[PDB]
Amino acid sequence: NNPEYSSFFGVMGASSAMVFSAMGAAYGTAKSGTGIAAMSVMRPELIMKSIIPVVMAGIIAIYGLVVAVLIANSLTDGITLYRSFLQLGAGLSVGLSGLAAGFAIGIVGDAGVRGTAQQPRLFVGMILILIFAEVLGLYGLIVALILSTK
Amino acid sequence: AHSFALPVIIFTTFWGLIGIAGPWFVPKGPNRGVIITMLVATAVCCYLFWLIAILAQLNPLFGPQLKNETIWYVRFLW
Amino acid sequence: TGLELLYLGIFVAFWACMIVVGICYTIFDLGFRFDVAWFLTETSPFMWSNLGIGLAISLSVVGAAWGIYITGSSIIGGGVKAPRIKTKNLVSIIFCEAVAIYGIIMAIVISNMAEPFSATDPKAIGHRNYHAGYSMFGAGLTVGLSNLFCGVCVGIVGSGAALADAQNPSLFVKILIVEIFGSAIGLFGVIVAILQTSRVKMG
Amino acid sequence: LCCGPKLAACGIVLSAWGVIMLIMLGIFFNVHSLIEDVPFTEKDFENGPQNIYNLYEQVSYNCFIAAGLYLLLGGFSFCQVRLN
Amino acid sequence: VRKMKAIYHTLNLCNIDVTQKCLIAEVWCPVTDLDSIQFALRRGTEHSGSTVPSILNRMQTNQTPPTYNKTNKFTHGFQNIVDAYGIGTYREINPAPYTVITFPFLFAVMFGDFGHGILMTLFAVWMVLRESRILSQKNENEMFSMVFSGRYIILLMGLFSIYTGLIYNDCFSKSLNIFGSSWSVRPMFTIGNWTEETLLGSSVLQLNPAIPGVFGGPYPFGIDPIWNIATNKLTFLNSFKMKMSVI
Amino acid sequence: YKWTAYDAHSSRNAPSLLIHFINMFLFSYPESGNAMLYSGQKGIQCFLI
Amino acid sequence: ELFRSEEMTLAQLFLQSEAAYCCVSELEELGKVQFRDLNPDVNVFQRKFVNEVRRCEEMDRKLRFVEKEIRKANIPIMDTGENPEVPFPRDMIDLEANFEKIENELKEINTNQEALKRNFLELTELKFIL
């Protein structure tokens, strides 16, 4: 009674949630590392502070891990399709959301690292702007979670 | 088996007295204003947090969906 | 322009092939072999619904996220000489999250309508389910894209606001009016998405 | 071996965490012989309440073995940080 | 010498009189401090051989002053996270006295984890136990200094996190069994036309019905532990927390 | 109110606070098809907005 | 009753520079008074405290120089107290010079020591050369 291929959409959800999130976090990490390497030469005392954008990106990667695992542990053979599309939506929703988050993380962090070194008063603002992007990424996680019971 | 009325009385009195009478029973040092703020703010936030948790579970529309092994176990556990 | 050349070549070949196949089906007088109704009916409404839901949430955050770093970089750069900027110009980012929130609320309210059908043969089955499916798809798309472009607008405008305020603190308040319009544009998309799903039923 | 007193201290903390948590786990199953209900049950679970009591005792045994290993680890790390 | 320099620096920040080789200086100080200062001034002038009366004249006119917030070893950290956002308006309501509790509470809701709440406090305690050793030492590691300065904030954050985790009954995903779980009476479940359901159960879960006439009664404190092992906790408990956050 | 007013006895088609809140703002007051939390709620919903 | 910021007055005080010296000493250790700049258009040369600050800067640098050499030598000097007494006599200038002499002496000794060290090595070679 189960439409064939019904399990195909579900499996893709778990994969996408992880892959797109890794892409975002990796982008943010790559951007931050570039700014950190350039900044840290003149002000090595800021090396520890400069990691924050990267930790935030790492959170995005976790966001994705949570959905990918939640879906994976929710896969079966006799999937009724309805459930499968919910899982695919959850994967795609958090994936793109984390991807965009990671980009905002990376771009802002790069500028933030340089700005803070030149003007330490900008440190709090740097965290704030990255914080909003992390909150946006969380939404991506939550909606993926909501679908799991619909 | 439990009623809701008793839990509410016990914990409402606890946090209520702390937030209302508490300020009367406080050291007179330079931190008195902070301790009074603590007593009142704590009682209000803590009470409301708990009250929702216990109130929200009254008149439930459904029970838990349990795995087979647990369902059997409970027969001889609770 | 290696990537732009790739994108163009794919775009042109993609549509050029569609033109040849479409016209050929006509030329060889095929019995409407390419049947749009067939595609729409065999394609499960569940995909359309869940796609629109994912779009509503996913596109909206992309917009916000786009604008955030647009204004973030401008603020961080300018703020080196005008640290006052962070005091007021953060509201540009609040508008960006607010655009995401518009879509987020709709994404949840729409998904709350998702139900199973227990349906099989589309023949005389789910007549209403197809309407609701397509409507949910549209409403999700409607708000998603609308918030996407709003978030870009707000970012561009907020960038100018930060650059302006760095040089003249009196300009901040007046400029705020532009971002408000940007937010209103996104709300317009919300109004339509609400109407589109105002009378739907699933299952 | 020295290994560094900073890392010996970390081992001592993990060892204390291990002994405390693992013994607690065995106790909870031993008392409620329970909500967690994670003793590694069989799939072909029959109508035998005694099977839950028996598996719970197995969990306690296994947990105390793990604690015993943390006792050995903590002992070794203890001497390292003290001598360092 | 560093103090000497400090003094001369301050002495530069003055106006030199023409009538007498005297300086006039302006300070912004509350009355409490002004009384203490007058006494301090007598002490100072007495150390100087000239014992000059050194008149300080109060100014009726008020000039937009800096914001002075008295803090202590515990509340200083909370004031700083307020100041990080901005310096409040003169005579503005200071949010910090409310932050001391409000912020830990919001964290405890965000971090409502009983088990980690304990670990979190223990971390803070470690720092406090070395308080005397950390203060009277060199601390070039700014991240360590920051968390040390916030050590009393962290401790409180853990304290409330335990409170909220306890009501949620989650300690590393572990429930807290107070022997009060009476949500349902399984013995009556089987009586309600469920005979040997554990045979079919091998392929099913089966959700416990509401109001069967034999179930009911709240959990004495917090969420009934039974939901911690349910497959639908994700609707029962998720909904409650949704409504709680809004409220 | 919802927590204290309705039991499982009305769990089927139980009133949804999300829908009533939305209908409140929009002044949408269907005559039937959706159970209200309490009699006269429509009047209160309109009044407050 | 809500917590609010403390008052900062606009008061002005007027007194002799000697009494001012002592008072600044007292107020700085007290730590409770926030001063305003009475001459925003006047530079340090214009304030006429530049001689005192310069003296401070020079002795400061000299002390730091010596301190750096002292630190290089790994000396135990606990630097335990007496700091709270904080006197500021004008005789500090003479104290500074005596400390200046130490710097010069120490530099001279190291310079000479290196020179002697070099001579030693050359003579050491000679020992082998013979």
- DSSP result, E103-172: HHHHHHHHT--HHHHHHHHHHHHHHHHTHHHHHTS----HHHHHHHHTHHHHHHHHHHHHHHHHHHT-SS
The Cα–Cα gap between B23 and B18 comes to 8
Amino acid at E143: M
CB-CB under 8 Å, G38 with E24: yes
Q: Are G44 and E9 in contact (CB under 8 A)?
A: no
Give the three-state DSSP class for C150. Answer: helix
The Cα–Cα gap between B26 and B36 comes to 7
The Cα–Cα gap between C176 and C92 comes to 8
Q: Which residues of E touch F10 (CB under 8 A)?
A: none
Q: Are C49 and C130 in contact (CB under 8 A)?
A: no
Q: Are G99 and G59 in contact (CB under 8 A)?
A: yes
CB-CB under 8 Å, F22 with C112: no
The Cα–Cα gap between G3 and E95 comes to 9
Phi-psi map region of G82: left, alpha, beta (phi>0 left; psi -120 to 50 alpha): left
Phi-psi map region of E158: left, alpha, beta (phi>0 left; psi -120 to 50 alpha): alpha
Q: Are B9 and B54 in contact (CB under 8 A)?
A: no
Q: Flag whether D touches F (3+ CB pairs, 8 A cutoff).
A: no
Tally of structural domains, chain D: 1
Give the three-state DSSP class for G25. Answer: helix
- Cα of first residue to Cα of last residue in chain F, in angstroms, is 19
Q: Which residues of C touch F23 (CB under 8 A)?
A: none
Token pair 């750069």 is at which residue?
C77
The Cα–Cα gap between E243 and E236 comes to 11
Q: How would you label C105-140 residue by residue, b for 16+ Cβ within 10 Å and e otherwise?
A: bbbbbbbebbeebeeeebeeebeebbebbbbbbbbb
Q: Are C102 and C187 in contact (CB under 8 A)?
A: yes
CB-CB under 8 Å, C69 with A104: yes
The Cα–Cα gap between C175 and C165 comes to 10
Token pair 């650059």 is at which residue?
C163
Is the CB of C191 inside 8 Å of chain F's CB atoms? no
For residue E210, the cross-strand partners are none
Cα torsion E179, E181, E185, E186: sign: negative
Maximal C-alpha separation, chain A: 67
Among G81, G27, G95, residue whose Cα is nearest residue E6? G27
Give the three-state DSSP class for G35. Answer: strand
**Residue B45: domain span:** 1-78
**Judging by beta carbons within 10 Å of its beta carbon (0-12, 13-18, 19+), is residue D7 exposed, middle or buried?**
middle
Give the three-state DSSP class for E74. Answer: coil
For residue E23, the cross-strand partners are E16, G15
Is the CB of F48 inside 8 Å of chain C's CB atoms? no
For residue E55, the cross-strand partners are G14
For residue B65, the cross-strand partners are E207
Please provide residue B67's backbone torsions phi and psi, each rounded to the nearest 5 degrees.
Answer: -75, 155
Q: Are G11 and E20 in contact (CB under 8 A)?
A: no
Q: Which residues of A touch E238 (CB under 8 A)?
A: 149
The Cα–Cα gap between A84 and A76 comes to 10
Give the three-state DSSP class for E15. Answer: strand
Q: Are G5 and E92 in contact (CB under 8 A)?
A: yes
- Chain length of chain D: 84
Q: Which residues of E touch B2 (CB under 8 A)?
A: 180, 182, 217-220
Which residues have CB under 8 Å from C190's CB, separation 6+? C102, C103, C105, C106, C143, C146
Token pair 């394609």 is at which residue?
C43
Helices A123-147, A82-118: crossing angle, 10 deg rounding: 180
* Cα-based distances in Å from C183 to A47, C148, C187, F18, F22: 38, 11, 6, 23, 20
The Cα–Cα gap between C80 and A32 comes to 19
The Cα–Cα gap between A88 and A65 comes to 15
The Cα–Cα gap between E4 and G66 comes to 19
Structure tokens at C16: 């050029």
* Cα-based distances in Å from G104 to E1, G94, G99, G111: 19, 15, 9, 10
Please provide residue F11's backbone torsions phi and psi, each rounded to the nearest 5 degrees.
Answer: -60, -30
Among A147, E205, E87, E126, residue whose Cα is nearest residue B62? E205
Among A112, A118, A136, the residue with its CB nearest the CB of C61 is: A136
The Cα–Cα gap between E17 and G97 comes to 32
Among E96, E32, E39, residue whose Cα is nearest residue E69? E96
Which residues have CB under 8 Å from D1's CB, separation 6+? D80
Maximal C-alpha separation, chain F: 31
| CA atoms within 13 A of residue E212's CA, in its CB half-sphere | 20
Among C170, C65, E21, E100, residue whose Cα is nearest residue A60? C65
Which residues have CB under 8 Å from C11's CB, separation 6+? none
Chain E: partners with 3+ C-beta pairs within 8 Å: A, B, D, F, G
Among C61, C65, C108, the residue with its CB nearest the CB of A146 is: C108
Resolution (in Å) of the shown entry?
A: 3.9
Give the three-state DSSP class for E16. Answer: strand
Among D74, D66, D73, residue whose Cα is nearest residue D22? D66
The Cα–Cα gap between C23 and C17 comes to 10
Q: Are G9 and E58 in contact (CB under 8 A)?
A: yes
Among G36, E85, G92, C109, residue whose Cα is nearest residue A150? C109
Alpha helix stretches (DSSP H) within chain C: 2-27, 36-42, 45-78, 85-88, 91-111, 127-167, 172-196
The Cα–Cα gap between A108 and E43 comes to 55
The Cα–Cα gap between A16 and A22 comes to 10
Among B55, B59, B62, the residue with its CB nearest the CB of F6 is: B59
The Cα–Cα gap between D74 and D16 comes to 7
Among B3, B50, B65, the residue with its CB nearest the CB of E232 is: B65
Give the three-state DSSP class for E28. Answer: strand
DSSP 8-class letter at A127: H
Q: Which residues of B touch F14 (CB under 8 A)?
A: 61
The Cα–Cα gap between A116 and C79 comes to 9
Nearest CA in chain B to F10: B61
Which residues have CB under 8 Å from C110's CB, separation 6+? C52, C53, C56, C136, C139, C140, C193, C197
Among D35, D43, D45, the residue with its CB nearest the CB of E177 is: D35
The Cα–Cα gap between C20 and G53 comes to 88
Structure tokens at E163: 């409170």
Alpha helix stretches (DSSP H) within A6-122: 6-40, 52-72, 82-118
Tally of structural domains, chain B: 1
Q: Are E102 and E78 in contact (CB under 8 A)?
A: no
CA E60 to chain B, closest CA, distance in angstroms equals: 30
Cα torsion D65, D71, D77, D79: sign: negative
Structure tokens at A144: 């993926």
Which residues have CB under 8 Å from D84's CB, separation 6+? D2, D4, D5, D8
Structure tokens at E149: 């300065």
Q: Are strands E22-28 and E15-16 parallel, antiparallel or unpaired?
A: antiparallel
Q: Are C59 and C148 in contact (CB under 8 A)?
A: yes
Q: Are C109 and C159 in contact (CB under 8 A)?
A: no
Chain D: partners with 3+ C-beta pairs within 8 Å: B, E
Q: Are B47 and B16 in contact (CB under 8 A)?
A: yes
DSSP 8-class letter at E207: B
Amino acid at C88: K
Is the CB of C195 inside 8 Å of chain F's CB atoms? no
**Chain interruptions in chain G, by residue before each (C–N > 2.5 Å):** none
**Residue A41: domain span:** 1-150
B17 sits in which H/E element: helix B5-20
Contacts 24+ apart (CB under 8 A), G66-69: G66/G99, G66/G102, G66/G103, G66/G106, G69/G106, G69/G110
Which residues have CB under 8 Å from A122's CB, separation 6+? A112, A115, A116, C76, C79, C80, C83, C86
Q: Which residues of C touch F18 (CB under 8 A)?
A: 109, 112
The Cα–Cα gap between C95 and C101 comes to 9
Phi-psi map region of E185: left, alpha, beta (phi>0 left; psi -120 to 50 alpha): beta
Quote the Cα angle for C173-C177-C179, to 5°.
Answer: 110
DSSP 8-class letter at A76: -
Tally of structural domains, chain A: 1
CB-CB under 8 Å, A118 with C65: no
- Chain length of chain C: 203
The Cα–Cα gap between C61 and A24 comes to 13
Structure tokens at G105: 């002496």
CB-CB under 8 Å, F4 with B59: yes
Cα torsion G82, G87, G93, G94: sign: negative
Helices C127-167, C172-196: crossing angle, 10 deg rounding: 180
Give the three-state DSSP class for E48. Answer: coil
For residue G15, the cross-strand partners are E23
Q: Which residues of E touch F11 (CB under 8 A)?
A: 210
* Cα-based distances in Å from A43 to A113, C119, E147: 11, 65, 21
For residue G12, the cross-strand partners are E26, E57
Alpha helix stretches (DSSP H) within D1-84: 5-31, 49-83
Which residues have CB under 8 Å from E92's CB, separation 6+? E67, G4, G5
Query: What is the number of CB-based contacts under 8 A between chain C and chain F?
Result: 3
G99 sits in which H/E element: helix G92-129
Q: Which residues of E touch G87 (CB under 8 A)?
A: none
Q: Are A21 and A61 in contact (CB under 8 A)?
A: yes
Among E7, E40, E37, E22, residue whose Cα is nearest residue G87? E7
